[PDB]
Design a protein around this ligand. Structure first.
Ligand SMILES: NC(=O)C1=CN([C@@H]2O[C@H](COP(=O)(O)OP(=O)(O)OC[C@H]3O[C@@H](n4cnc5c(N)ncnc54)[C@H](OP(=O)(O)O)[C@@H]3O)[C@@H](O)[C@H]2O)C=CC1
Ligand SMILES: NC(=O)C1=CN([C@@H]2O[C@H](COP(=O)(O)OP(=O)(O)OC[C@H]3O[C@@H](n4cnc5c(N)ncnc54)[C@H](OP(=O)(O)O)[C@@H]3O)[C@@H](O)[C@H]2O)C=CC1
Lengths: 324, 324
């Protein structure tokens, strides 16, 4: 059993791949032979030791996995069945998916959606799952294509890439915000009508000119504050991230004078029914071209190279991890 | 034609009751003989000159009125008809309701709902209208009496008083936040289960203990920031005010880790359909005891005094205004 393992000394996190035994895995009524995982921003924070994502060491990181069920004391799952997992504290406070085996509670698993397989499921991963929940939040708020432009921040990343592709597919005019010139052609190829620079979202009045029918935000901080000030009357912002900072120095003005909805989107504890709905929607609404335009396959032990890259804003798209 | 008129010299606002000619009224399709108005927080800002609510003087303030139609060039409205008005820029950049006559666009009016008269309509006013929109926002977010406690800030005020009464009638367990010990009995009599002091809502961590199923906030600033940190997973905050300050020094944490919705509530430009729904619901759900328990009926020339009291956190309930 090969596993990426986090250890802690003198404050710092060390990441290495070690050969563990089956016996070291935590209790959990379903054992899964993991074939694929991925790197999300939260995984990168954990692996580099930034932000105190993980409080208990040693720890196998990886909030995502997909593979084949080895055994099951949960009668909903059987040996041979393709399953996936995102969230539920896995990869944070419970040994995760960046390993050839994981053991988890059956409630945390999702039976493989029809039209999907383990590889494609992990290209999507937590970031794509989260993008879908964000699109669904915009739809719950009555934001339709004809209402105006949708803005996506941190657009070149995982959630952002998925969001641009989903929205373009669903008929929306999408505007991407990126802090790098090198992402422009990639973002246009995903379906973005144009790409605005991040340095134009550094400061804002409480109320800016109305330009967005809706928004999907992955950066928080001053970018989210400006986006809120730019929302159309009745518009909605689906906020899922903190890539630019966890604080939100905003005002009540967009809320109380423009009836703006700021919908928070969490992926960790998404209830079973909405979880299943999001996956079903991804199979239908994410075009097959995405799985080759946005994905980069890496091996397990080179994950820390790419975790550093994520933190350092040197990553584009989705990092798929082949575990075997 | 009696009217509270605001002038401006040396950057200070001067409020007085003057007798004006009919010919000084602005152009409008519908002339209304106003019998009743009210004072909301916004009117108080305008009358005292605090903030920049009013940019063009002279101005008749008053974002609300109710009365009888005098003349009409708009075929939807006839002489003799009972009508009300809240918002639409009236009392801000168009001569308002604290006067014996107003002249307005027919789109801005609401035909008197059945079960309601001009007096009761202004006891409710913008503040009560707003409270109803906030309760409706909580319902849109799936918050039900069984889900847990609803917190109402600035509870002794107009929006707050209406909110507590509406929620108690609808079956919710309500918790009021007030910064004065003198409001406690009043708030209990409206339907509040308990009253927490406002000094316990000053500083907050990004995430506090989950305690609120939903919230209606009239204060903004640091009170709203703490309430956000205290929301249950999937909870909703309807935010409509800035009584404690217009800034919002919060974080993204409640949003991204607890799926919290921050629904902003505006009353100025609420579209016709939603507007009519709120008034219909106010007739259904506001108990008759509210009109006696929260109302204080003043004359036009007492409006500057009551405006000061509002800014200085010295009123309780709703200020109704007998215009004639
Ligand atoms: N709570 C939850 O359940 C979930 C939360 N998330 C959140 O979504 C957010 C993004 O996730 P993911 O796509 O995986 O991360 P990525 O790193 O792949 O993308 C984030 C993007 O943000 C931009 N960015 C990076 N650094 C900064 C910075 N310092 N200031 C401003 N912008 C920056 C970059 O785009 P560019 O170069 O174009 O500016 C980058 O591509 C994360 O904060 C993550 O926590 C995601 C899934 C679930
Ligand atoms: N955008 C829109 O369409 C609408 C906005 N609103 C807003 O709702 C808010 C309240 O309206 P309204 O009820 O009419 O005003 P009120 O003055 O009647 O209510 C405000 C309450 O807030 C509390 N308060 C007052 N000052 C402070 C302070 N400095 N710090 C903390 N709390 C304070 C008081 O309660 P206590 O003493 O118990 O602490 C007071 O009763 C206003 O900001 C108003 O503009 C209302 C309707 C519509």
């Amino acid at each position: 059993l090969q596993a990426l393992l986090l250890e802690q000394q003198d404050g710092k996190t060390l990441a290495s791949v070690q050969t563990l035994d089956e016996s070291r895995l935590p209790e959990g009524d379903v054992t899964v032979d993991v074939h694929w995982s991925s790197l999300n921003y939260k995984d990168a924070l954990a692996i580099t030791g930034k932000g105190k994502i993980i409080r208990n060491f040693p720890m196998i990181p990886g909030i995502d996995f997909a593979g084949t069920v080895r055994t099951s004391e949960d009668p909903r799952f059987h040996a041979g069945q393709e399953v996936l997992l995102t969230g539920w504290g896995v990869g944070e406070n419970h040994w995760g998916g960046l390993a050839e085996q994981a053991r988890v509670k059956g409630d945390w698993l999702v039976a493989m959606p029809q039209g999907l397989d383990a590889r494609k499921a992990m290209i999507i991963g937590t970031a794509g799952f989260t993008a879908m929940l964000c699109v669904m939040a915009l739809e719950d708020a009555g934001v339709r294509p004809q209402d105006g432009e949708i803005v996506v921040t941190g657009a070149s990343g995982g959630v952002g890439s998925t969001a641009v592709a989903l929205l373009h597919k669903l008929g929306y005019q999408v505007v991407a915000v990126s802090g790098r010139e090198s992402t422009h052609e990639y973002l246009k190829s995903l379906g973005a009508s144009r790409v605005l620079p991040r340095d134009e979202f550094a400061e804002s009045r409480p109320l800016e000119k109305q330009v967005w029918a809706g928004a999907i935000d992955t950066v928080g901080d001053k970018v989210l504050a400006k986006v809120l000030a730019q929302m159309n009357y009745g518009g909605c912002v689906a906020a899922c991230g903190l890539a630019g900072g966890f604080t939100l120095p905003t005002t009540v003005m967009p809320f109380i004078l423009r009836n703006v909805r700021l919908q928070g989107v969490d992926s960790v504890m998404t209830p079973p029914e909405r979880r299943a709905q999001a996956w079903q929607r991804l199979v239908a609404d994410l075009p097959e071209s995405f799985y080759t335009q946005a994905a980069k396959e890496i091996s397990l032990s080179e994950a820390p190279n790419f975790a550093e890259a994520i933190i350092n804003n040197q990553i584009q798209g989705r990092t798929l991890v082949k575990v075997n």
